Short mmCIF file of C-alpha atoms in Angstrom, two decimals:
data_model
loop_
_atom_site.label_atom_id
_atom_site.label_comp_id
_atom_site.label_asym_id
_atom_site.label_seq_id
_atom_site.Cartn_x
_atom_site.Cartn_y
_atom_site.Cartn_z
CA UNK Q 226 -25.17 14.43 -25.34
CA UNK Q 227 -23.02 15.89 -22.17
CA UNK Q 228 -21.10 19.27 -22.37
CA UNK Q 229 -19.66 21.75 -19.72
CA UNK Q 230 -20.00 18.70 -17.26
CA UNK Q 231 -17.48 16.75 -15.13
CA UNK Q 232 -16.99 12.85 -15.40
CA UNK Q 233 -16.50 11.22 -12.41
CA UNK Q 234 -14.79 7.53 -12.72
CA UNK Q 235 -15.50 5.20 -9.55
CA UNK Q 236 -18.15 4.63 -6.82
CA UNK Q 237 -15.70 4.89 -3.55
CA UNK Q 238 -16.89 7.05 -0.71
CA UNK Q 239 -14.49 9.84 -2.05
CA UNK Q 240 -16.28 9.47 -5.57
CA UNK Q 241 -19.80 9.44 -4.29
CA UNK Q 242 -19.26 12.45 -2.05
CA UNK Q 243 -17.40 14.65 -4.66
CA UNK Q 244 -20.36 13.68 -7.13
CA UNK Q 245 -22.88 15.01 -4.54
CA UNK Q 246 -20.70 18.19 -3.49
CA UNK Q 247 -20.85 18.96 -7.35
CA UNK Q 248 -24.42 18.48 -7.70
CA UNK Q 249 -25.04 20.84 -4.94
CA UNK Q 250 -23.04 23.51 -6.49
CA UNK Q 251 -25.14 23.23 -9.80
CA UNK Q 252 -23.08 21.22 -11.71
CA UNK Q 253 -23.80 18.49 -14.22
CA UNK Q 254 -21.93 15.13 -13.27
CA UNK Q 255 -21.55 12.01 -15.63
CA UNK Q 256 -20.45 8.76 -13.59
CA UNK Q 257 -18.76 5.78 -15.15
CA UNK Q 258 -19.26 2.52 -12.65
CA UNK Q 259 -17.92 -0.95 -13.38
CA UNK Q 260 -20.40 -2.22 -10.71
CA UNK Q 261 -22.76 -5.12 -11.33
CA UNK Q 262 -26.36 -4.40 -12.80
CA UNK Q 263 -27.96 -4.68 -9.41
CA UNK Q 264 -25.36 -2.29 -7.60
CA UNK Q 265 -25.70 0.34 -10.42
CA UNK Q 266 -29.44 0.81 -9.34
CA UNK Q 267 -28.56 1.29 -5.38
CA UNK Q 268 -25.91 3.73 -6.58
CA UNK Q 269 -28.23 5.71 -8.96
CA UNK Q 270 -30.76 5.84 -6.02
CA UNK Q 271 -27.65 6.96 -3.63
CA UNK Q 272 -27.01 9.80 -5.87
CA UNK Q 273 -30.39 11.29 -6.64
CA UNK Q 274 -33.16 12.42 -9.20
CA UNK Q 275 -30.61 13.86 -12.13
CA UNK Q 276 -28.17 10.79 -11.83
CA UNK Q 277 -26.29 10.12 -14.81
CA UNK Q 278 -24.69 6.93 -14.36
CA UNK Q 279 -22.78 5.15 -17.29
CA UNK Q 280 -22.26 1.57 -16.45
CA UNK Q 281 -18.99 0.59 -17.98
CA UNK Q 282 -15.21 0.43 -17.91
CA UNK Q 283 -13.55 4.03 -17.74
CA UNK Q 284 -9.99 2.33 -18.87
CA UNK Q 285 -11.85 1.99 -22.17
CA UNK Q 286 -11.58 4.82 -24.26
CA UNK Q 287 -14.70 4.34 -26.12
CA UNK Q 288 -16.86 4.81 -22.90
CA UNK Q 289 -14.76 7.71 -22.18
CA UNK Q 290 -16.00 9.47 -25.56
CA UNK Q 291 -19.55 8.52 -24.92
CA UNK Q 292 -19.56 9.89 -21.30
CA UNK Q 293 -18.23 13.19 -23.28
CA UNK Q 294 -14.65 13.63 -22.54
CA UNK Q 295 -14.44 15.99 -25.37
CA UNK Q 296 -16.71 18.52 -24.00
CA UNK Q 297 -16.16 18.37 -20.04
CA UNK Q 298 -14.66 20.60 -17.70
CA UNK Q 299 -12.72 18.06 -16.28
CA UNK Q 300 -12.45 14.19 -15.71
CA UNK Q 301 -12.03 12.79 -12.30
CA UNK Q 302 -10.29 9.53 -11.43
CA UNK Q 303 -11.70 8.79 -7.92
CA UNK Q 304 -11.86 4.93 -7.73
CA UNK Q 305 -10.38 2.70 -4.71
CA UNK Q 306 -7.64 1.13 -7.26
CA UNK Q 307 -4.76 3.67 -8.21
CA UNK Q 308 -3.95 1.33 -11.30
CA UNK Q 309 -7.25 2.23 -12.88
CA UNK Q 310 -7.00 5.83 -11.87
CA UNK Q 311 -3.44 6.26 -13.37
CA UNK Q 312 -4.72 4.56 -16.49
CA UNK Q 313 -7.97 6.73 -16.63
CA UNK Q 314 -5.67 9.79 -16.86
CA UNK Q 315 -3.56 8.15 -19.72
CA UNK Q 316 -6.27 7.57 -21.58
CA UNK Q 317 -7.64 11.13 -21.28
CA UNK Q 318 -4.55 12.53 -22.20
CA UNK Q 319 -4.23 10.12 -25.15
CA UNK Q 320 -7.74 11.50 -26.56
CA UNK Q 321 -7.85 14.99 -26.14
CA UNK Q 322 -4.73 16.32 -24.02
CA UNK Q 323 -6.39 19.78 -23.18
CA UNK Q 324 -8.78 17.81 -21.03
CA UNK Q 325 -8.14 18.73 -17.09
CA UNK Q 326 -7.52 15.59 -15.08
CA UNK Q 327 -7.75 14.95 -11.46
CA UNK Q 328 -6.67 12.15 -9.51
CA UNK Q 329 -7.16 10.97 -6.07
CA UNK Q 330 -4.69 8.31 -4.64
CA UNK Q 331 -6.06 5.44 -2.59
CA UNK Q 332 -2.62 4.57 -1.38
CA UNK Q 333 -0.26 7.30 -0.32
CA UNK Q 334 2.47 4.88 -1.17
CA UNK Q 335 1.57 5.61 -4.93
CA UNK Q 336 2.13 9.28 -4.87
CA UNK Q 337 5.45 9.21 -6.64
CA UNK Q 338 4.09 6.55 -9.16
CA UNK Q 339 1.02 8.73 -10.17
CA UNK Q 340 2.94 11.84 -10.27
CA UNK Q 341 4.65 9.84 -13.63
CA UNK Q 342 1.41 10.14 -15.41
CA UNK Q 343 1.26 13.86 -15.01
CA UNK Q 344 -2.37 14.91 -13.93
CA UNK Q 345 -3.41 18.33 -13.61
CA UNK Q 346 -4.63 17.73 -10.03
CA UNK Q 347 -3.72 15.12 -7.48
CA UNK Q 348 -5.51 14.59 -4.06
CA UNK Q 349 -4.12 12.19 -1.32
CA UNK Q 350 -6.78 12.31 1.36
CA UNK Q 351 -4.48 11.08 3.90
CA UNK Q 352 -1.56 13.53 3.24
CA UNK Q 353 -3.60 16.33 2.14
CA UNK Q 354 -5.74 16.18 5.64
CA UNK Q 355 -2.47 15.56 7.52
CA UNK Q 356 -0.88 18.55 6.26
CA UNK Q 357 -3.65 20.87 6.70
CA UNK Q 358 -4.16 19.28 10.22
CA UNK Q 359 -0.53 20.12 11.03
CA UNK Q 360 -0.85 23.90 10.15
CA UNK Q 361 -4.19 24.45 11.77
CA UNK Q 362 -2.88 23.05 15.12
CA UNK Q 363 0.16 25.18 14.82
CA UNK Q 364 -1.76 28.33 14.69
CA UNK Q 365 -0.97 29.12 11.03
CA UNK Q 366 -3.35 30.37 8.88
CA UNK Q 367 -4.10 28.60 5.46
CA UNK Q 368 -4.79 31.30 2.73
CA UNK Q 369 -6.43 30.35 -0.88
CA UNK Q 370 -3.09 30.28 -2.56
CA UNK Q 371 -1.72 27.53 0.04
CA UNK Q 372 -4.69 25.60 -0.19
CA UNK Q 373 -4.46 25.17 -4.45
CA UNK Q 374 -0.76 24.90 -4.15
CA UNK Q 375 -1.17 21.48 -2.27
CA UNK Q 376 -3.54 20.38 -5.11
CA UNK Q 377 -1.92 21.38 -8.06
CA UNK Q 378 0.75 19.35 -9.67
CA UNK M 289 7.00 16.44 27.91
CA UNK M 290 5.28 20.01 27.78
CA UNK M 291 3.52 22.14 25.38
CA UNK M 292 3.54 19.32 22.88
CA UNK M 293 1.34 17.28 20.86
CA UNK M 294 0.40 13.55 21.63
CA UNK M 295 -0.29 11.39 18.61
CA UNK M 296 -2.30 7.98 19.32
CA UNK M 297 -2.26 5.57 16.44
CA UNK M 298 0.63 4.55 13.87
CA UNK M 299 -1.66 4.71 10.66
CA UNK M 300 -0.42 6.49 7.46
CA UNK M 301 -2.75 9.51 8.54
CA UNK M 302 -1.04 9.47 11.83
CA UNK M 303 2.55 9.04 10.51
CA UNK M 304 2.32 11.87 8.13
CA UNK M 305 0.41 14.23 10.78
CA UNK M 306 3.56 13.34 13.18
CA UNK M 307 6.17 14.31 10.32
CA UNK M 308 4.29 17.33 9.34
CA UNK M 309 4.02 18.47 13.00
CA UNK M 310 7.65 17.93 13.27
CA UNK M 311 8.63 19.85 10.09
CA UNK M 312 6.74 22.83 11.56
CA UNK M 313 9.06 22.41 14.60
CA UNK M 314 6.59 21.42 17.11
CA UNK M 315 7.61 18.47 19.69
CA UNK M 316 5.31 14.88 19.52
CA UNK M 317 4.94 12.29 21.81
CA UNK M 318 3.56 8.98 19.54
CA UNK M 319 1.83 6.14 21.52
CA UNK M 320 1.01 3.16 19.68
CA UNK M 321 0.38 -0.81 20.45
CA UNK M 322 2.98 -2.13 17.75
CA UNK M 323 5.21 -5.10 19.05
CA UNK M 324 8.72 -4.32 20.17
CA UNK M 325 10.08 -4.82 16.79
CA UNK M 326 7.59 -2.71 14.67
CA UNK M 327 8.07 -0.06 17.48
CA UNK M 328 11.88 0.30 16.23
CA UNK M 329 10.99 0.29 12.58
CA UNK M 330 8.59 2.89 13.49
CA UNK M 331 10.99 5.16 15.72
CA UNK M 332 13.35 5.12 12.43
CA UNK M 333 10.71 6.36 10.22
CA UNK M 334 10.11 9.35 12.53
CA UNK M 335 13.58 10.69 12.46
CA UNK M 336 16.06 11.03 15.22
CA UNK M 337 13.51 13.07 17.71
CA UNK M 338 11.25 10.13 17.62
CA UNK M 339 9.57 9.86 21.29
CA UNK M 340 7.49 6.58 21.00
CA UNK M 341 5.86 5.28 24.13
CA UNK M 342 4.69 1.60 23.52
CA UNK M 343 1.82 1.24 25.11
CA UNK M 344 -2.17 0.98 25.29
CA UNK M 345 -3.84 4.76 24.62
CA UNK M 346 -7.03 3.32 26.21
CA UNK M 347 -5.45 3.30 29.50
CA UNK M 348 -5.17 6.70 31.03
CA UNK M 349 -2.00 5.94 32.73
CA UNK M 350 -0.25 5.87 29.84
CA UNK M 351 -1.73 8.80 28.76
CA UNK M 352 -0.49 10.52 31.97
CA UNK M 353 2.97 9.16 31.12
CA UNK M 354 2.80 10.90 27.64
CA UNK M 355 1.87 14.27 29.33
CA UNK M 356 -1.77 14.99 28.57
CA UNK M 357 -1.89 17.14 31.37
CA UNK M 358 0.52 19.64 29.52
CA UNK M 359 -0.02 18.88 25.90
CA UNK M 360 -1.39 21.44 23.30
CA UNK M 361 -3.88 18.93 22.25
CA UNK M 362 -4.13 15.05 21.90
CA UNK M 363 -4.77 13.34 18.42
CA UNK M 364 -6.56 10.07 17.90
CA UNK M 365 -5.35 9.02 14.31
CA UNK M 366 -5.42 5.19 14.29
CA UNK M 367 -7.30 2.98 11.86
CA UNK M 368 -9.77 1.78 14.56
CA UNK M 369 -12.48 4.14 15.41
CA UNK M 370 -13.34 2.37 18.53
CA UNK M 371 -10.00 3.09 19.77
CA UNK M 372 -10.22 6.90 18.80
CA UNK M 373 -13.40 7.41 20.25
CA UNK M 374 -12.05 5.95 23.61
CA UNK M 375 -9.01 7.76 23.63
CA UNK M 376 -11.38 10.94 23.32
CA UNK M 377 -13.59 9.90 26.53
CA UNK M 378 -10.31 9.10 28.32
CA UNK M 379 -8.87 12.59 27.86
CA UNK M 380 -12.13 14.38 28.76
CA UNK M 381 -12.24 12.35 31.85
CA UNK M 382 -8.73 13.64 32.95
CA UNK M 383 -8.51 17.24 31.89
CA UNK M 384 -11.55 18.59 30.22
CA UNK M 385 -9.48 21.43 29.18
CA UNK M 386 -7.25 19.37 26.80
CA UNK M 387 -7.93 20.05 22.92
CA UNK M 388 -9.35 16.76 21.33
CA UNK M 389 -8.50 15.70 17.64
CA UNK M 390 -10.28 12.60 16.07
CA UNK M 391 -9.94 11.28 12.36
CA UNK M 392 -12.70 8.91 11.18
CA UNK M 393 -11.08 5.81 9.65
CA UNK M 394 -14.53 4.35 8.53
CA UNK M 395 -16.79 7.45 7.12
CA UNK M 396 -19.88 5.30 8.17
CA UNK M 397 -18.74 5.81 11.94
CA UNK M 398 -19.06 9.50 11.79
CA UNK M 399 -22.32 10.10 13.24
CA UNK M 400 -21.43 7.75 16.13
CA UNK M 401 -18.12 9.71 16.92
CA UNK M 402 -19.70 12.83 17.17
CA UNK M 403 -21.52 11.60 20.37
CA UNK M 404 -18.45 11.58 22.27
CA UNK M 405 -18.03 15.16 21.31
CA UNK M 406 -14.34 15.73 20.09
CA UNK M 407 -13.01 19.45 19.37
CA UNK M 408 -11.87 18.64 15.72
CA UNK M 409 -13.09 16.02 13.77
CA UNK M 410 -11.20 15.07 10.37
CA UNK M 411 -13.03 12.65 7.85
CA UNK M 412 -10.26 12.58 5.26
CA UNK M 413 -12.59 11.38 2.44
CA UNK M 414 -15.44 13.86 3.20
CA UNK M 415 -13.03 16.88 3.78
CA UNK M 416 -11.07 16.04 0.58
CA UNK M 417 -13.91 15.47 -1.70
CA UNK M 418 -15.82 18.82 -0.27
CA UNK M 419 -12.54 20.96 -1.10
CA UNK M 420 -12.22 19.37 -4.54
CA UNK M 421 -15.68 20.24 -5.32
CA UNK M 422 -15.21 23.93 -4.38
CA UNK M 423 -12.02 24.40 -6.03
CA UNK M 424 -13.43 22.60 -9.25
CA UNK M 425 -16.49 24.93 -8.80
CA UNK M 426 -14.09 28.21 -8.92
CA UNK M 427 -14.53 29.10 -5.22
CA UNK M 428 -11.78 30.44 -3.05
CA UNK M 429 -11.10 28.98 0.27
CA UNK M 430 -9.83 31.09 3.23
CA UNK M 431 -8.52 30.19 6.24
CA UNK M 432 -11.76 30.75 8.12
CA UNK M 433 -13.86 28.73 5.87
CA UNK M 434 -10.98 25.71 5.95
CA UNK M 435 -11.05 26.07 9.91
CA UNK M 436 -14.75 25.91 10.03
CA UNK M 437 -14.76 22.45 8.13
CA UNK M 438 -12.65 21.03 10.92
CA UNK M 439 -14.11 22.50 13.99
CA UNK M 440 -16.88 20.41 15.65
#
């Protein structure tokens, strides 16, 4: 029974570090991974002692309900497959509606495509980082409102 | 070629950093190892100001041709971490005053690239994940905190 927690879909480098950063801030995280029985083990240890890894498929809404999407703070589609991330978002919008969704893009080319599934937050690691680099090198100061603006869709 | 930026690479990160720098009004000199044909396609994707020097970033003579002696900073943004680390070393061998920026293609290479001491290190996956965590945790990120994440 998970509540007021974050659900992370995926086991990519972006997903793992986001889970760790969330744990470090005292947040509860529930991970869903389609990895093999053997790999789930290496991942649970890769994460820590309070690792809540639900072996399964996030495209399936029954696993999402199980993971607790009804009581989470947000669901994060962070795998290296943009088709699965786009779908995780669709499934979620189809279950609750008011649930907050975050989606990271693996291939910057797909950005306009995922815009179509309307996630609350979109993160393209390559474009976000390049835009920030451009500003910082240009001596421009980036305040909090500018940063959040590059994330909110 | 003075008071400008030099980007070594033609990866997705490289191209968008060049585009973003141009939009901010900054001049940029791009060096890539792409074949004659691919070079042409690259210049067209970078607009009319496309200053593309087909060559080898590891060769300090192409770096001089690109104007590292008079640049604002040199950016190592290709998808090959060996080449990015070498570009940095090359730069520190010429000016030792030239600002170096390096983007890690493979997160596992982070520790080994810190050994070449670049001025700025951008690990896209780590940077992005950390900012997501912060924002979802309700924190506010000010320019100082952001910069700190980039400074090596």
